[PDB]
Ligand binder design. Structure first.
Ligand SMILES: [Mg+2]
Lengths: 32, 191, 53, 111, 291, 130
RNA sequence: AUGAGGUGGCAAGAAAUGGGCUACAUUUUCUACCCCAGAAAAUUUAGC
């Protein structure tokens, strides 16, 4: 039987926010 | 001032130094990489002031550690293929119609592309409820869109500006073709 | 976009003008670069011109 | 290096998808590059050590320039802000600048 | 010029950069090798430049800087080698050794080393006459009853380049479902490409694209070209051929089929007949093509 | 960061909708570039990401194209291709993967994504009109 | 008046040589086929 999953959705910047949450601050650099 | 690669440890978190796509920074990349055709009794040029290394689309922001760390955080966004569809044998059984559409990624100010409106519907006639006369009429109506070898009817729509409109038009064309294949005019009798 | 033949109601129904405007609308219904408004504006210009002549 | 080394030893200063087979707007990108180069050579007079590198990803526009350490850093920041804002409002795209200072011209050979 | 402290510093910089690259690529720094360095640098800094040298490179400093500056005396100034003052201590040391071996023996598909390679190994420039003298001594050593040690010593100076044999690699024999033996081969002439299957036993039937050869090739010249391989080895009417040719024109297709059939037939003839076919031009791809 | 670390991170809001998800039988990603090394690096990145997301990927190399022209002085334009065919991925997986790899598309490289969605027959065509 | 107009004319002739374009066939031409058919009728340019 074909159980089609549900279409989960996210905000436009959601992927960028996840990728950003993946990385920490650079301790040896001056601010961006 | 001294480059900050002197302060970078041998066990640092490299992805935090290059989070996103960035140009080559010889003061940030702690590698003694050289590039350039050497002169006679010369060496390839050093990185500081090297325009050739600056011209490379470097992948310092995508290292295997960084890629794995990215793809572990992105798993939250994914859904699962219905396991009942194990192969194309069942993908062509439970879902007879196939809709092909294309997106184009160039570089510039305008994202528009005239070729993205095209839609291609593919359906096997054996998967439609057609009798002998209905199938004969449908084949004669469509013409070259029907390929005898594959038993596939391929309707390509690009008339409308948008892509949803071309998809709706392809569906409408299929509907009307089926209905006019199942219909026998008075005139048909003279074959 | 694809059925623009309702805008030919005020034209002649069976003369050569019907033929010409059927050709025009068949061309316009195959136009992916125009909006519906521009197509109907073309049809209305044709109406005006043929009304004058 | 001479022009017959452009894919053998040198590279391309500008990098964009326009000239690939099937892509469009190569002319517009070329004119954009021309204006960027003249504008930048007129806005950083005697600072640029070498040619610009013009990179393009999506609608982004990165100018990687190599300048000298002869002009004051405050003026460098003022000009970076000015040029970024002006070029973003002129091309209606997010332009960005990545100055790299060098103590002096990086001479390769003597011709 | 490159001082020794300068290269020392480049050595620590290379080692630290190697450890950093191992960190970046996730590999274990202890076992991270130079091939790994090359692969990682190729990934991180992709470059399509045709010149391999122009591409980005991260080598050991010793591989970059030549530094062919060997010290030949210590702090007291005494030279290390007893032939130092000749100026050719390595070359004359080698000549002394060879003469010693010649004296000892007197009491009891490969090539001589080229001059510049001998220079590379001796790390000293030498003239043509002294090279000839050394080679003459080596020949004299070979003429005498050289033992295992002397044979190895001369082999240090003997390179294996000379001679190359043109033997015409044969295709293997395959067997079809019916149990018949056949061999397949390919040929090309201009833009025509052909693949022929030659059976061991037959009655001389050639089928081109499923069509008889005399129907597929109306022109007698093409039929003579197809006849040439089998006639040359006197086995007309003894093999069946099933070929497929595409592209080109009439003569190009005939020539490609001729080549494919000859190469497939080489399986069922003796090596002498293979060499005769080669010397007749029947096994060489014709490279002549339009500008 | 050795001690100063973010105590918590705000994960983006991904909501599980009620609508059914789109299904893609195939998803062909053709990338074009002037540089073979850049395409090899992008292929490595894309394939590793596909493995880490569980997507099934195959890679092949379409033949190159060369456009030569003259103003004598002869100029050339090379176009090299890499094709990444993904199989049996849903709508959300395809969107997230495509966003990732398109945002990380290198300069000078263009993309053409062909998506082959699977659809059922419309209700209005199942049986003839009586 | 090197500006703007009007009224008439103007529309050449002969060679020797330099060059260019067209058609120029029987090993040809038309039809069927793509090759076993039937009807019609002196310097100069390259060489490899
Ligand atoms: Mg006149």
């Amino acid at each position: 039987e074909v159980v089609i999953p549900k279409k989960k959705t996210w905000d436009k910047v959601a992927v960028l926010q996840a990728l950003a949450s993946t990385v920490n601050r650079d301790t040896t650099a001056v601010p961006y | 001032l001294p480059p900050r690669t002197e302060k970078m440890a041998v066990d640092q978190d490299w992805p935090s130094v290059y989070p996103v796509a960035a140009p080559f920074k010889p003061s940030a990349v702690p590698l003694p990489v050289r590039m350039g055709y050497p002169v006679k009794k010369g060496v390839p040029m050093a990185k500081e002031g090297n325009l050739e290394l600056l011209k490379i689309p470097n992948f310092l922001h995508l290292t295997p550690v960084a890629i794995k760390k990215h793809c572990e955080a992105l798993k939250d966004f994914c859904t699962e293929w219905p396991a009942a569809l194990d192969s194309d044998e069942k993908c062509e059984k439970h879902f007879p119609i196939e809709i092909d559409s294309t997106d184009y990624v160039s570089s510039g100010p305008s994202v528009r592309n005239p070729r993205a409106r095209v839609v291609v519907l593919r359906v096997k006639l054996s998967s439609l409820n057609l009798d002998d006369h209905a199938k004969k009429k449908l084949i004669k109506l469509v013409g070259e869109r029907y390929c005898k070898t594959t038993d596939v009817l391929t309707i390509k729509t690009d008339r409308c500006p948008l892509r949803r409109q071309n998809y709706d038009y392809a569906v409408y064309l299929l509907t009307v073709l089926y209905h006019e294949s199942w219909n026998t005019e008075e005139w048909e009798k003279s074959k | 976009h694809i059925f623009l033949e309702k805008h030919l109601e005020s034209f002649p129904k069976q003369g050569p003008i019907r033929h010409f405007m059927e050709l025009v609308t068949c061309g316009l219904s195959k136009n992916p670069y125009l909006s519906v408004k521009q197509k109907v504006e073309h049809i209305e210009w044709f109406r005006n011109y043929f009304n004058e002549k | 290096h001479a022009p017959h080394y452009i894919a053998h030893r040198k590279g391309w200063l500008s990098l964009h998808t326009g000239n690939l087979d099937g892509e469009d707007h190569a002319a517009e990108r070329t004119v954009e590059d021309v204006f960027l180069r003249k504008f930048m050579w007129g806005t950083f007079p005697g600072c640029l050590a070498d040619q610009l590198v013009l990179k393009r990803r999506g609608n982004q526009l990165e100018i990687c320039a190599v300048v000298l350490r002869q002009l004051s850093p405050h003026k460098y920041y003022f000009l970076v802000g000015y040029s970024e804002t002006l070029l973003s409002y002129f091309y209606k795209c997010p332009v960005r600048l990545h100055l790299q200072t060098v103590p002096s011209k990086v001479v390769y050979k003597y011709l | 010029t490159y001082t020794e402290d300068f290269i020392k510093k480049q050595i620590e910089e290379f080692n630290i950069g190697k450890r950093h690259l191992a960190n970046m690529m996730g590999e274990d720094p202890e076992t991270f090798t130079q091939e790994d360095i090359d692969r990682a640098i190729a990934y991180l800094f992709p470059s399509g430049l045709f010149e391999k040298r122009a591409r980005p490179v991260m080598k050991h400093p010793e591989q970059i800087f030549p530094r062919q500056r060997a010290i030949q005396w210590g702090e007291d100034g005494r030279p290390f080698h007893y032939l130092f003052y000749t100026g050719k201590q390595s070359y004359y040391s080698l000549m002394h050794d060879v003469y010693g071996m010649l004296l000892n023996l007197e009491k009891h598909g490969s090539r001589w080393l080229i001059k510049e390679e001998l220079e590379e190994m001796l790390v000293e420039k030498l003239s043509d006459l002294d090279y000839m003298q050394f080679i003459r001594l080596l020949e004299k050593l070979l003429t005498s009853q050289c033992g295992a040690a002397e044979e190895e010593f001369v082999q240090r100076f003997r390179r294996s380049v000379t001679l190359e044999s043109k033997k015409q690699l044969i295709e293997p024999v395959q067997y079809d479902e019916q149990g018949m033996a056949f061999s397949k081969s390919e040929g090309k002439r201009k833009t025509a490409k052909a693949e022929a299957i030659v059976y061991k036993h037959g009655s001389g039937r050639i089928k081109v694209n499923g069509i008889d050869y005399q129907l597929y090739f109306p022109i007698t010249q093409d039929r003579e070209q197809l006849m040439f391989p089998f006639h040359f080895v006197d086995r007309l009417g003894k093999h069946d051929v099933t070929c497929t040719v595409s592209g080109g024109g009439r003569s190009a297709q005939a020539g490609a089929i001729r080549l494919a059939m000859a190469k497939a037939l080489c399986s069922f003839v003796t090596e002498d007949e293979v060499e005769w076919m080669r010397q007749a031009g029947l096994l060489t791809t014709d490279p002549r093509v339009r500008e | 960061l050795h001690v100063d670390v973010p105590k918590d991170l705000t994960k983006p809001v991904v909501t599980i909708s009620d609508e059914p998800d789109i299904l893609y039988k195939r998803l062909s990603v053709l990338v074009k570039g002037h540089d073979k090394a850049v395409l090899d690096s992008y292929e490595y990145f894309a394939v590793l990401a596909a493995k880490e997301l569980g997507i099934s990927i195959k890679v092949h190399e379409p033949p190159r194209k060369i456009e030569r022209f003259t103003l004598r002085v002869q100029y050339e334009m090379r176009t090299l291709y890499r094709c990444l065919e993904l199989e049996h991925l849903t709508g959300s997986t395809a969107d997230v993967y495509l966003e990732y790899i398109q945002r990380n598309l290198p300069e000078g490289v263009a993309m053409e994504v062909t998506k082959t969605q699977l659809e059922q027959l419309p209700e209005h065509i199942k049986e003839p009109i009586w």
